[PDB]
């Protein structure tokens, strides 16, 4: 549709990009949100562990990495909070999902349950658990 505020470009519409983005955990519609959130949190915590231990205030002392690891965990907690409130102000208890109903081709498909109170709650819980697990794994691998 030429009258929609979007353009078709090789980057935005390519088989490789489409496949890679559709295989990301944030776009798997059929899977329940908990398993996606667990993976997202694991990856985010494992990434976040590094910079705190590499550029922290105590980075030159012997405690450094341990302290940095703790800081990373704290950040995850804050992020989890930033998720929870976002659910409370967005999705009500009884309203259905607000995800798009039809695909690009035009076929009718089941809307994602991530945009729901229970779905978002599961996503946040999985994200918190995965973030804590990833931070712990990164610390153990780096300093053992």
């Amino acid at each position: 549709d030429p009258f929609i505020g979007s353009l078709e470009t090789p980057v935005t519409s390519s088989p490789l990009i489409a496949w890679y983005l559709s295989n990301l955990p944030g776009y798997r519609t059929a899977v329940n949100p908990l398993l996606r959130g667990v993976e997202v949190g694991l990856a985010h915590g494992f990434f976040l562990v590094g910079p705190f231990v590499k550029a922290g205030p105590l980075r030159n002392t012997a405690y450094a990495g341990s302290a940095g690891s703790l800081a990373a965990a704290g950040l995850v907690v804050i992020l989890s909070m930033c998720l929870t409130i976002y659910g409370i102000s967005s999705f009500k208890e009884g309203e259905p999902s607000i995800a798009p109903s039809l695909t690009l081709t035009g076929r009718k498909k089941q809307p994602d349950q991530l945009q729901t109170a229970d779905g978002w709650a599961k996503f946040t819980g999985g994200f918190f658990f995965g973030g804590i697990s990833g931070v712990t794994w990164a610390y153990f691998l780096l300093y053992v």
Binding site: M81, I85, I88, S89
Partner: peptide
């Protein structure tokens, strides 16, 4: 003693977060 080491982090960090969360939730409520 050591009261400042317990009270400064509380007022500086925890209370602003609690107040911000409460105010955001109250504002966004319909």
């Amino acid at each position: 003693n050591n009261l400042p080491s317990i009270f400064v982090p509380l007022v500086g960090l925890v209370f602003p977060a609690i107040a911000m969360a409460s105010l955001f939730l109250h504002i966004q409520k319909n």
